[PDB]
Structure to design on (157 residues):
């Protein structure tokens, strides 16, 4: 069955150069981070990303998990996003879990990626502008090549 490849920290930036963050409501928002001068042991810390072993033609299986007040992993129930309090599994029976995510680089860009459902296509992760915060949900835009539904992932070390 499924399996864990390697767990490591990765910075998730948005289209406006915003780093994913969590709030008191365990909601995935987007904040601003320089990471230029404060990089030297910066207080803030992004969520953890666990890579799973998958032998697919094109598909990066990853899983985001926020650690601080309570470990919570990003899980997409049906069409909405929900944070499930639980550390990233070490070995899953199914190849596509509710927490598993399908990352796919975007063609014709620097290093953008697209978050797709573990099961199959139909719903892609995007960022919704709510009030003064950019939240993250699962929707189906009209254009798959729209930056609005594109995200950036970097290595944290």
């Amino acid at each position: 069955y499924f399996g864990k490849l390697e767990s490591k920290l990765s910075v998730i930036r948005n289209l406006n150069d915003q780093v994913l963050f969590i709030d008191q409501g365990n909601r995935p928002l987007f904040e601003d981070m320089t990471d230029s001068d404060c990089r030297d042991n910066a207080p803030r810390t992004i969520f953890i990303i666990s890579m799973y072993k998958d032998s697919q033609p094109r598909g990066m299986a990853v899983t985001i998990s926020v650690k601080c007040e309570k470990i919570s992993t990003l899980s997409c129930e049906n069409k909405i996003i929900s944070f499930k309090e639980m550390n990233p599994p070490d070995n899953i029976k199914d190849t596509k879990s509710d927490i598993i995510f399908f990352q796919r680089s975007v063609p014709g860009h620097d290093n953008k990626m697209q978050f797709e459902s573990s099961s199959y296509e139909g719903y892609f992760l995007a960022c919704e502008k709510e009030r003064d915060l950019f939240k993250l949900i699962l929707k189906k835009e009209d254009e798959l090549g729209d930056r609005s539904i594109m995200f950036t992932v970097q290595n944290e070390d």
User: Anything to note?
Assistant: The domain at 1-157 is CATH 2.80.10.50 (Trefoil (Acidic Fibroblast Growth Factor, subunit A)). The chain has one domain: 1-157. The longest strand covers residues 4-13. DSSP finds no helices and 13 strands in the chain.
